[PDB]
Amino acid sequence: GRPEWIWLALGTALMGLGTLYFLVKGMGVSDPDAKKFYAITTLVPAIAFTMYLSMLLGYGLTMVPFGGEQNPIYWARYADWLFTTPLLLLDLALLVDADQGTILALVGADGIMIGTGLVGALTKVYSYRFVWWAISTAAMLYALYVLFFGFTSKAESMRPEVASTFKVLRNVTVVLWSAYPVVWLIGSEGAGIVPLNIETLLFMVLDVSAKVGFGLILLRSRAIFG
Ligand SMILES: *C/C=C(C)/C=C/C=C(C)/C=C/C1=C(C)CCCC1(C)C
Ligand SMILES: CCCCCCCCCCCCCCCC
Ligand SMILES: CCCCCCCCCCCC
Ligand SMILES: CCCCCCCCCCCC
Ligand SMILES: CCCCCCCCCC
Ligand SMILES: CCCCCCCCC
Ligand SMILES: CCCCCCCCC
Ligand SMILES: CCCCCCCCC
């Protein structure tokens, strides 16, 4: 009965509900272009639901020694993030007709971000936890820079309704993702200032907003149609 369970349960509920909702709407769609946005966007909270439910049930948690103490670390988050973050980036890229080489660079930076975040979360030398954290943040900032500078440029060649939707979704992405590195720094993985229950609260609000909120904006737009 870990106190954070309540936010793991509410995350499960919300990701499950948004998945079913996106699935129902997406199955009703015949436009093949919108279909592609629904498939990507429905899979995102579906991965997040299975990870939240795993953690809810006691999996995806390990203990890592650092600072003279055994610290609980939820590693299943990175299993979620590894696939959902590039799926999110793809949605953006498809919206703006981004180049293939841009997408590959993006997904790559994304993989580094989550990969180094995870190595950081498991590292037993306290100071080195932060080296990995900084590397992961650096990769993240590359991706935000691409979304904000490169994808907006591409967005400007699209019809205004598409560019407008891109911009809301880009803004939501910049705000939410920029917060994760800060929560990790001050929370359980990092300085141990924010307790595990509050930090789980913070990730759940970030995750739901960034996946269901994101998908609610994309999937209700005219922007996704051929
Ligand atoms: C649905 C989940 C989302 C949108 C997750 C976003 C996660 C990140 C942007 C992760 C960022 C991290 C860093 C920038 C460095 C340290 C730890 C990581 C994984 C949390
Ligand atoms: C053409 C030139 C150059 C350069 C470079 C850039 C710098 C760096 C940093 C960082 C970050 C963030 C991003 C964005 C977002 C809204
Ligand atoms: C329960 C979950 C569902 C759904 C998701 C997914 C999207 C992938 C299927 C599209 C392949 C044609
Ligand atoms: C093709 C591999 C993707 C990476 C391309 C550029 C950049 C980045 C990043 C990383 C981090 C410190
Ligand atoms: C002892 C401090 C180690 C610093 C190494 C960081 C290099 C990674 C650059 C990407
Ligand atoms: C892909 C980045 C590799 C950098 C290794 C950092 C060394 C940590 C002490
Ligand atoms: C010895 C202090 C380390 C310096 C921190 C710089 C981190 C930049 C990402
Ligand atoms: C505004 C948040 C500050 C939290 C730090 C206070 C915790 C005391 C150890």
From Swiss-Prot:
UniProt gene name: bop
Listed PROSITE patterns: BACTERIAL_OPSIN_1, BACTERIAL_OPSIN_RET
Annotated InterPro entries: Arc/bac/fun_rhodopsins (IPR001425), Rhodopsin_retinal_BS (IPR018229)
GO biological process terms on file: phototransduction; proton transmembrane transport
Family per similarity comment: Belongs to the archaeal/bacterial/fungal opsin family.
Cited function: Light-driven proton pump.
Name listed for the protein in its UniProt record: Bacteriorhodopsin
Residues under site feature: Primary proton acceptor: 80
Gene Ontology CC terms: plasma membrane
Record keywords, A-Z: Cell membrane, Chromophore, Hydrogen ion transport, Ion transport, Membrane, Photoreceptor protein, Pyrrolidone carboxylic acid, Receptor, Retinal protein, Sensory transduction, Transmembrane, Transmembrane helix, Transport
Compartments where found: Cell membrane
Modified residues (N6-(retinylidene)lysine): 211
MF (Gene Ontology): light-driven active monoatomic ion transmembrane transporter activity; monoatomic ion channel activity; photoreceptor activity
Membrane-spanning ranges: 5-24, 39-57, 75-91, 103-122, 130-149, 168-186, 199-218
Extracellular side: 58-74, 123-129, 187-198
Record flagged with keyword Transport: yes
Subunit structure: Homotrimer.
Pfam family, one: Bac_rhodopsin
